[PDB]
Amino acid sequence: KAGCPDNGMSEEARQKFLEMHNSLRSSVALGQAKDGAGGNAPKAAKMKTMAYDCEVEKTAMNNAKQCVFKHSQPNQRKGLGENIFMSSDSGMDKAKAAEQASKAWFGELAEKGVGQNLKLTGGLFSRGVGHYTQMVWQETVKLGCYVEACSNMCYVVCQYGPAGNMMGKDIYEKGEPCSKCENCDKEKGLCSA
Ligand SMILES: [Zn+2]
């Protein structure tokens, strides 16, 4: 969560990023997340808790500080996934940007729909739900993000340790919350190491 350098990113913003991610992963794991394809997203049997990672934030920073809205190429973030977001409000509070970015990515579920088949098929990936799927990717347990105030945008980049969005793999295992992990509160649905 912390022990990160004084590099332009604030503790408040890191906190918000992590809290939003774990909170939203919990909502999904508990069967409480509204799915645009109908009903709610399926309950998750072993949705893993995320931790904040300063090293992942550094590579997210490398993208953000370029002030060009685009995905970085894989080898500029070796082994990591990535979500990107922008707002025209360039001087936005960094925690506010974290909240807005996290909501925009997660919103893909409610807006575009995913459905009850969580295998990441070519069909599913091409529908543009890939920011959401990375946020709730079961095996992704490291989060690191950077918010950069650019000339004409606030630019937010999050990166994700173990990369998610592996084609042909399930986003997460379906089952009752905590049913396939030990360190997990049935009312939260998040598995700790
Ligand atoms: Zn994207």
XYZ file of C-alpha atoms and ligand atoms in Angstrom:
194
model
C 0.000 0.000 0.000
C 2.862 2.227 0.904
C 6.598 2.598 1.212
C 6.381 4.102 -2.254
C 8.643 7.003 -3.245
C 7.695 10.678 -3.227
C 7.464 10.667 -7.038
C 4.424 12.826 -7.785
C 1.891 10.154 -6.906
C 0.190 10.667 -3.523
C -0.467 8.142 -0.744
C -4.084 9.252 -0.825
C -4.340 8.365 -4.522
C -2.584 5.015 -4.060
C -4.986 4.251 -1.217
C -7.992 5.108 -3.331
C -6.800 2.959 -6.242
C -6.272 -0.064 -4.013
C -9.493 0.431 -2.031
C -11.566 0.849 -5.198
C -10.017 -2.266 -6.709
C -10.491 -4.489 -3.675
C -13.990 -3.115 -3.004
C -15.108 -3.756 -6.592
C -13.527 -7.233 -6.683
C -15.449 -7.970 -3.465
C -18.758 -6.740 -4.949
C -18.194 -9.040 -7.911
C -17.130 -12.025 -5.766
C -20.264 -11.688 -3.601
C -22.603 -11.795 -6.607
C -23.613 -8.163 -6.131
C -22.249 -6.578 -9.308
C -24.836 -5.564 -11.927
C -24.158 -7.118 -15.361
C -25.367 -5.327 -18.497
C -25.855 -8.750 -20.061
C -28.519 -9.292 -17.388
C -28.711 -10.209 -13.709
C -25.455 -9.929 -11.756
C -21.924 -11.142 -12.504
C -21.338 -14.649 -11.135
C -20.054 -15.167 -7.593
C -16.309 -15.859 -7.357
C -14.945 -18.879 -5.461
C -11.459 -17.471 -4.835
C -11.219 -13.809 -5.784
C -7.771 -12.716 -4.631
C -7.002 -9.620 -2.569
C -4.851 -7.023 -4.329
C -1.842 -5.316 -2.790
C -0.294 -2.036 -3.911
C 3.090 -2.455 -5.620
C 5.534 0.467 -5.943
C 7.498 -1.255 -8.713
C 4.365 -1.698 -10.822
C 3.584 1.989 -10.237
C 6.970 2.931 -11.721
C 6.186 1.244 -15.013
C 2.702 2.732 -14.994
C 4.439 6.097 -14.466
C 6.560 5.540 -17.595
C 3.367 5.470 -19.655
C 1.562 8.287 -17.810
C 4.421 10.798 -17.949
C 4.493 10.614 -21.763
C 1.161 12.467 -21.772
C -0.155 10.545 -24.763
C -3.331 8.500 -24.319
C -2.344 5.011 -25.492
C -1.480 1.565 -24.244
C 2.173 0.874 -23.653
C 3.645 -2.063 -25.550
C 4.042 -5.265 -23.462
C 7.820 -5.010 -23.082
C 7.576 -1.570 -21.458
C 5.605 -3.368 -18.745
C 6.993 -6.916 -18.802
C 4.577 -9.446 -17.298
C 1.955 -6.799 -16.500
C -1.539 -5.873 -17.604
C -2.691 -2.270 -18.076
C -5.737 0.007 -17.897
C -5.723 3.606 -19.143
C -8.092 6.521 -18.579
C -8.251 10.230 -19.365
C -10.296 13.259 -18.344
C -10.287 16.754 -19.831
C -10.009 18.104 -16.267
C -6.177 18.157 -16.283
C -5.652 19.444 -12.737
C -8.083 16.985 -11.150
C -7.319 15.867 -7.585
C -5.321 12.631 -7.908
C -7.562 10.570 -5.605
C -10.546 11.925 -7.523
C -8.864 10.760 -10.745
C -8.279 7.341 -9.146
C -11.962 7.048 -8.247
C -13.077 8.205 -11.709
C -10.702 5.870 -13.579
C -11.605 2.851 -11.441
C -15.328 3.516 -11.965
C -14.913 3.979 -15.731
C -13.057 0.677 -16.107
C -15.385 -1.254 -13.809
C -18.376 0.336 -15.547
C -17.704 -1.784 -18.629
C -19.493 -4.658 -16.841
C -22.752 -2.739 -16.257
C -22.631 -0.865 -19.565
C -21.468 -3.451 -22.113
C -22.250 -6.637 -20.220
C -20.096 -9.716 -19.784
C -22.445 -12.588 -18.983
C -22.071 -15.891 -17.142
C -19.359 -17.382 -19.371
C -16.115 -16.003 -17.969
C -13.752 -17.653 -20.439
C -11.890 -14.851 -22.199
C -12.811 -15.824 -25.760
C -11.906 -13.716 -28.779
C -15.593 -12.862 -28.832
C -15.557 -11.542 -25.284
C -12.280 -9.672 -25.537
C -13.306 -7.852 -28.721
C -16.399 -6.438 -26.973
C -14.322 -3.851 -25.110
C -14.750 -5.116 -21.559
C -11.011 -5.580 -21.098
C -10.526 -2.874 -18.482
C -13.191 -4.467 -16.316
C -11.857 -7.998 -16.840
C -8.374 -6.909 -15.803
C -9.748 -5.219 -12.660
C -11.427 -8.438 -11.534
C -8.881 -10.925 -12.901
C -8.666 -13.549 -10.152
C -4.931 -14.170 -10.412
C -3.942 -10.487 -10.568
C -2.775 -9.462 -7.083
C -0.494 -6.470 -7.673
C -1.719 -2.972 -8.515
C 0.410 0.085 -9.318
C -0.883 3.303 -10.860
C 0.168 6.828 -11.724
C -1.826 10.008 -12.336
C -0.211 12.644 -14.532
C -1.469 16.199 -15.089
C -0.862 16.876 -18.789
C -1.394 20.007 -20.883
C -4.904 19.055 -22.021
C -5.782 15.989 -19.934
C -5.481 14.234 -16.630
C -3.948 10.904 -17.642
C -4.312 7.837 -15.459
C -2.489 4.553 -15.993
C -2.822 1.439 -13.843
C -0.690 -1.660 -14.289
C -1.426 -5.136 -13.061
C 0.836 -7.837 -11.650
C 0.489 -11.028 -13.054
C -1.026 -9.655 -16.247
C -4.669 -10.573 -16.701
C -6.602 -10.853 -19.953
C -4.920 -14.073 -21.055
C -6.921 -15.377 -24.031
C -8.784 -18.628 -23.358
C -8.473 -18.406 -19.559
C -11.322 -17.707 -17.132
C -11.468 -14.209 -15.636
C -12.167 -15.861 -12.296
C -13.345 -19.225 -10.993
C -17.099 -19.376 -10.387
C -18.409 -20.538 -7.011
C -19.600 -19.341 -3.626
C -17.390 -16.626 -2.062
C -14.373 -18.135 -0.244
C -15.360 -21.660 -1.256
C -11.921 -22.323 -2.753
C -9.589 -20.434 -0.439
C -8.762 -20.373 3.254
C -8.087 -16.785 4.258
C -11.388 -15.262 3.263
C -14.443 -13.700 4.944
C -17.704 -14.980 3.365
C -19.122 -11.483 3.718
C -16.191 -9.956 1.777
C -15.251 -12.729 -0.660
C -11.574 -11.748 -0.936
C -8.816 -14.359 -0.483
C -5.580 -13.389 1.226
C -2.283 -15.211 0.710
Zn -7.514 -0.562 -23.138
